[PDB]
């Protein structure tokens, strides 16, 4: 037995009177102090100590015992270990050749149960080995710094709950007070006690590996494309800043990640195809050659029962029975009738802050489900009206009631926010506010149930009014009906009414619309699984910076034909099939006015022979959309051209921008940080050609800056001048020019 040995050792330690006073005086907390007492020192330069110490005679220390005695004192002249004991371990000091003597002629130990301890590492190697690689492509990549999970887990738990799990698995007699985590995690504990059955690995290594495979490591990494953990563990070899590698790991991909990647794919396909001509054709064409990491898009659309709005449009375009099943966190809803509309509004929330939350016009009806509880819901804008929930478990009824309160955006839940809720990241990026409210009221809804507003219950023989404990009472919350009948929640899946038009609108068999292409979200997020387009011009399903850089590279490459058939051909150059992917990232309220302005600038350059080739490259891709003018038969005047996403995605008309810069000294164009040498494509005298001729629409250069016209004029002032008028304009910092309109 190993108990009487410890009692004999405790009787031994009481004779050392210093150890007796240390045992009697030091408390169990202060043990954490006296464990770290030594004569050592944290080395400020450890690489120098390793390089200096490896050249010495005996640089290592041995654990005192029977296993260090098996190493001999010398081996063929080489002195392995010495007799001088160590200060800390009180064992002998050996050379680094003693390690190789142990690996070559030492005793052979029982490594039974080894592949079950380090199973996270062998599963990592298995995901590498059973993987396949694809093409490598060169081109721009916009990486977004996102907080992602580094390694995949067996089960994601909070660190104190995972510590309770590890203490139940490894050291069960010291787990202390039992939590409720033992009953949830009983099969994981039984499995992990089966797997670590008869191993001789020390329990500190087992605890380190169990904490490695249960506790999450979430860090900020630059991510473009896939953010699931099986891709974040290969993010170093997945893509860089200027290349991408198609990769599919081993194992088996999930269903939530598959559905979220399907939603991201359908949103990108719709967001590209809306600005096209004949949008249904390009929607089906791109959707037929999309691969969600192993499998086509149609297989995910026919195998997964989710997908919000864009998935239904791509489903009905490919030909598929649509599934109108929304998922608000854990709230699985399916509509009956009613068509809301999203619009941003500055809600003044209960704790005293302003948030741009989206609210919905209309009146809607839902079949809702949470866990093993079901119900029917009916609402309007910021107004929970009716909720007939079936009877199920009490806390499942609680979760469903809280989720239906949060979903309806009812003002008794908006003003019922009294606590600490952070609607922003630590790095200052937008969190979704409704999911923040949902995660807040899933724990602390006592303010919600206090100030929600009570009423009386209907006292029919089938209905039961609810108190806060979900039992039978009458001081009930406003609008909750508990009938004992059945509801047949998700069995009434019958709508054979696809019938899409050109503009991607699911028109019913009656004749009305239920879905629209001006109904999908605008919040572009990164997919969990890698998503490929097996097509020429995959880059048209790219971000704003990638589309800008690819479009400007394509204009630069084909510059001679564009410029020659612009000087010779009149109105072919604008309506070009390579610029639809550039109008995919211009807002639809501004694109026609941008097109009229840029077309007037280029027409002004070609009519009177002043040509800046940087202005031609800059304002050529904005010309594709059909132009929209003002009411005076005049185009608009802009200082910058603002594109989708971010605040640094603008094209300055006069000076440089982040996305577009031009240097006339070195003749170097800079698109998104990449330098294209324009040396050899510009004309002869283009450094003495006037710059203010290609700045506004109908505004040439009449001469040098003169103070008899007053100060500089802004764009609203120049938009309201008479034709045949002089003005003063600052092009960039240092060049004021006197300018005649028309």
């Amino acid at each position: 037995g190993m108990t009487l040995a410890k009692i004999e050792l405790l009787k031994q330690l009481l004779r050392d009177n210093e150890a007796k006073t240390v045992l009697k005086q030091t408390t169990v907390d202060q043990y954490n102090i006296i464990r770290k007492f030594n004569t050592s020192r944290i080395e400020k330069n450890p690489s120098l100590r390793m390089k200096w110490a490896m050249c010495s005679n005996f640089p290592l220390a041995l654990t005192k015992g029977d296993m260090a005695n098996r190493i001999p004192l010398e081996y063929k002249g080489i002195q392995l270990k010495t007799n001088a004991e160590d200060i800390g371990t009180k064992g002998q000091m050996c050379s680094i050749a003693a390690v190789t003597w142990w690996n070559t002629y030492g005793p052979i130990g029982d490594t039974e149960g080894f592949e079950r301890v380090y199973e996270s590492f062998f599963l990592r190697k298995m995901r590498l080995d059973n993987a396949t690689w694809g093409r490598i492509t060169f081109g721009p990549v916009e990486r977004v710094r996102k907080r992602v999970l580094l390694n995949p887990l067996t089960k994601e738990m909070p660190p104190d709950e995972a510590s309770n799990v590890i203490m139940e698995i490894l050291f069960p007699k010291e787990a202390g007070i039992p939590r409720e985590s033992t009953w949830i995690h009983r099969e994981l504990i039984k499995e992990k006690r089966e797997k670590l059955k008869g191993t001789m690995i020390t329990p500190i290594v087992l605890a380190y590996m169990l904490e490695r495979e249960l506790v999450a490591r979430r860090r900020f990494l630059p991510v473009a494309g896939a953010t699931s953990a099986e891709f974040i563990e290969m993010l170093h070899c997945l893509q860089g800043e200027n290349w991408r590698q198609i990769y599919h790991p081993g194992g088996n991909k999930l269903t939530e990640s598959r559905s979220q990647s399907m939603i991201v794919a359908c949103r990108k396909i719709i967001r590209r195809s809306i600005v096209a001509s004949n949008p249904l054709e390009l929607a089906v064409e791109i959707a037929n050659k999309t691969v969600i990491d192993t499998e086509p898009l149609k297989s995910c659309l026919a195998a997964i029962d989710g997908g919000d709005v864009a998935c239904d449009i791509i489903r009905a375009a490919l030909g598929l029975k649509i599934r109108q099943r929304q998922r608000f966190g854990r709230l699985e809803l399916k509509r009956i009738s009613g068509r809301g509309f999203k619009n941003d509004e500055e809600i003044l929330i209960g704790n005293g802050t302003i948030q741009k939350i989206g609210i919905w016009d209309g009146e809607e009806e839902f079949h809702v489900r949470c866990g093993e509880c079901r119900g029917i819901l009916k609402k309007s804008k910021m107004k929970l009206e009716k909720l007939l929930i079936n009877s199920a478990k009490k806390e499942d009824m609680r979760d469903l009631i809280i989720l239906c309160m949060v979903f309806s955006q009812d003002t008794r839940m908006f003003q019922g926010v009294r606590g600490e809720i952070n609607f922003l990241n630590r790095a200052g990026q937008l969190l979704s506010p409704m999911y923040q409210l949902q995660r807040y009221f899933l724990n602390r809804s006592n303010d919600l149930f206090d100030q929600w507003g009570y009423e009386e219950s209907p006292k029919a023989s089938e209905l039961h009014g609810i108190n806060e404990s979900m039992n039978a009472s009458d001081y009930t919350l406003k609008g909750v009906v508990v009938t004992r009948n059945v509801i047949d929640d998700f069995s009434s899946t019958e709508t054979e009414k696809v019938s899409i038009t050109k503009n991607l609108s699911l028109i019913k068999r009656t004749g009305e619309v239920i879905m629209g292409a001006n109904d999908v979200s605008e919040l572009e997020s990164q997919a969990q699984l890698m998503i490929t387009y097996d097509t020429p011009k995959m880059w048209e399903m790219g971000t704003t910076k990638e589309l800008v850089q690819n479009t400007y590279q394509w204009v630069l490459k084909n510059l001679v034909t564009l410029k020659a058939q612009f000087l010779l051909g009149k109105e072919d150059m604008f309506q070009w099939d390579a610029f639809e992917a550039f109008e995919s990232i211009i807002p639809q309220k501004m694109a026609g006015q941008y097109s009229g302005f840029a077309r007037a600038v280029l027409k002004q350059m070609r009519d009177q022979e002043v040509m800046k080739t940087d202005q031609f490259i800059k304002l050529l891709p904005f010309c594709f959309s059909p132009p929209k003018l003002r009411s005076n038969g005049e185009p608009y005047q802009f200082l910058k051209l603002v594109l989708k996403g971010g605040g640094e995605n603008f094209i300055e008309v006069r000076k440089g921008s982040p996305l577009f810069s031009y240097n006339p000294q070195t003749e170097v164009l800079t698109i998104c940080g990449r330098m294209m040498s324009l040396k050899g494509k510009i004309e002869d005298e283009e450094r003495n050609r006037s710059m203010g001729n290609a700045v506004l629409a109908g505004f040439l250069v009449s001469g040098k800056y003169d103070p008899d016209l007053g100060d500089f004029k802004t764009i609203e002032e120049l938009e309201k001048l008479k034709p045949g008028e002089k003005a003063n304009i600052l092009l960039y910092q240092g060049k004021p020019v006197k300018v005649v309109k028309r």
Partner: protein, 486 residues
């Protein structure tokens, strides 16, 4: 309360911001131009472009460095048996007799049949290493009662002018050779296409570094610092002969063993990290020290024989120098291969920025060219006051040589100089981008730069090259003032 505290403060508390122009950019370091100051000597550890290795063909094996030097000297036995010193140049506080006795001791000890390269502690060895030169530690009362024991004035570095040999080292180390001194080990086989792209790009980026002279010098430094650290920790109270060797491979695969000299180690009981071990280095060369005698006042040069490389008669000189090092410089000499990475990445990133413009891989199309793309060329030199362009590989070799001279001539003067001139580089860049930069106190910037230019050769030649480059940037900016021409 801030408006009332700012209404009563003096108007003399201001930034006084001045708008920066090109005319405000005077040349840094005028005192390196005046000829009263002596030109800066050679103070590196080993010879770099004046080196000469005694080759000896081997069969792709390893052996003891004593037997390597013994065989390399057995081939050149004329230089080994020369026992008559022909003194050419002598350092001021040196001893030509003791350094020649130490050279004969190194030759007679590296070429016997015993396996031990220890050196006896004779009077010339004790002079060249320095024995009993440390001061005695006495108690503080015995010295407080004294009046002669004053605190010494610490030495400040000298002020030197531009020496013409640093440009010669920069020109010679960037040129290709026919030998490959790198010892790069293997990696795993390739599966992913990124690994194939990396291997194909490495077969371009590594050969250009590998054939140049600076990689041979780098490997000489690395191997000498490794063996010197091992012998400093191993045998502490012993003077040991450490041969300066390198292993080299020609264009046809035949290996050779270059022996560049011998080196004596002092008595290294190095406790602190800044404690010095004395190293007396004897190195072969073929450079006449009286062509450029302002470069070597630290070296004692003998003439020990002649060699026939193909058909011509090159003399062989021996450069003897007392020198020293510590554990920190030896550790950074072992980790001196990283001058590859800082030179490779900076060029490889450029190649990657080409590929995103073109869609395919552009390593061959930047090093050599193809049917569509022209080769890549960089402004890298100056001939008769005009520009000189070069290839991508020459720019890679130039950045590798710069990152090697950062190690070899690197002390606190180079740290302060780089950190204080980076702001001036960014100001010149802000003038080139037409951002219109403003300065608050420009003379403080120059005064903080110029206090680090004392006697480091790389710092003085970097100030010279900065003045030359700034003069080239000023005269090219005149097309920016000619825009809109009104």
């Amino acid at each position: 309360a801030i408006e009332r505290n700012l209404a009563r403060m003096s108007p003399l508390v201001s930034v006084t911001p001045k708008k920066l122009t090109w005319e405000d950019l005077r040349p840094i370091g005028p005192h390196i131009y005046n000829h009263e100051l002596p030109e800066v000597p050679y103070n590196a550890f080993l010879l770099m472009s004046d080196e000469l290795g005694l080759a000896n063909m081997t069969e792709g094996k390893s052996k003891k460095p004593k037997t390597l030097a013994k065989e390399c000297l057995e081939k050149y036995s004329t230089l080994r048996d020369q026992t008559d010193p022909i003194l050419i140049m002598k350092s001021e506080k040196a001893n030509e007799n003791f350094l020649w006795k130490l050279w004969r001791d190194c030759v007679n000890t590296i070429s016997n049949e015993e396996m031990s390269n220890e050196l006896q502690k004779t009077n010339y060895a004790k002079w060249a290493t320095g024995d009993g030169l440390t001061y005695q530690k006495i108690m503080k009362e015995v010295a407080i009662d004294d009046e002669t024991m004053c605190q010494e004035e610490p030495k400040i570095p000298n002020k030197c002018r531009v020496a013409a040999w640093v440009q010669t080292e920069m020109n010679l180390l960037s040129t290709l050779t026919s030998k490959r001194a790198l010892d790069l080990p293997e990696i795993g086989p390739d599966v992913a296409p990124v690994e194939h792209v990396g291997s194909e790009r490495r077969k371009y980026f590594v050969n250009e570094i590998n054939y140049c002279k600076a990689s041979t010098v780098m490997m000489k430094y690395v191997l000498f610092h490794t063996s010197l650290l091992n012998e400093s920790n191993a045998s502490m109270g012993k003077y040991k002969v450490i041969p300066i060797t390198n292993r080299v491979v020609n264009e046809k695969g035949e290996s050779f063993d270059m022996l560049y000299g011998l080196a004596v180690k002092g008595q290294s009981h190095l406790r602190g990290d800044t404690d010095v071990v004395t190293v007396v280095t004897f190195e072969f060369s073929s450079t006449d020290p009286r062509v450029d005698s302002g470069k070597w006042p630290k070296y004692t040069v003998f003439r020990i024989g002649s060699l026939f490389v193909s058909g011509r008669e090159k003399s062989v000189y021996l450069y003897c120098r007392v020198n020293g090092t510590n554990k920190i410089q030896m550790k950074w000499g072992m980790e001196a291969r990283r001058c590859l990475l800082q030179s490779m990445q900076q060029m490889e990133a450029i190649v990657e920025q080409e590929s995103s413009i073109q869609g395919y891989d552009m390593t061959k199309a930047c090093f050599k060219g193809d049917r569509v793309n022209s080769p890549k060329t960089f402004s890298i030199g100056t001939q008769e006051g005009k520009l000189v362009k070069g290839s991508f590989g020459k720019a890679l070799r130039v950045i590798f040589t710069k990152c090697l001279m950062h190690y070899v001539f690197g002390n606190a003067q180079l740290e302060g100089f780089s950190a204080e001139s980076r702001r001036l580089l960014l100001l010149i860049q802000a003038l080139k981008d037409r951002k219109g930069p403003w300065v608050f106190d420009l003379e403080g910037m120059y005064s903080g730069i110029e206090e680090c230019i004392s006697n480091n050769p790389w710092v003085i030649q970097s100030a010279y090259w900065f003045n030359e480059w700034l003069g080239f940037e000023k005269e090219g900016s005149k097309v920016l003032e000619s825009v809109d021409e009104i």
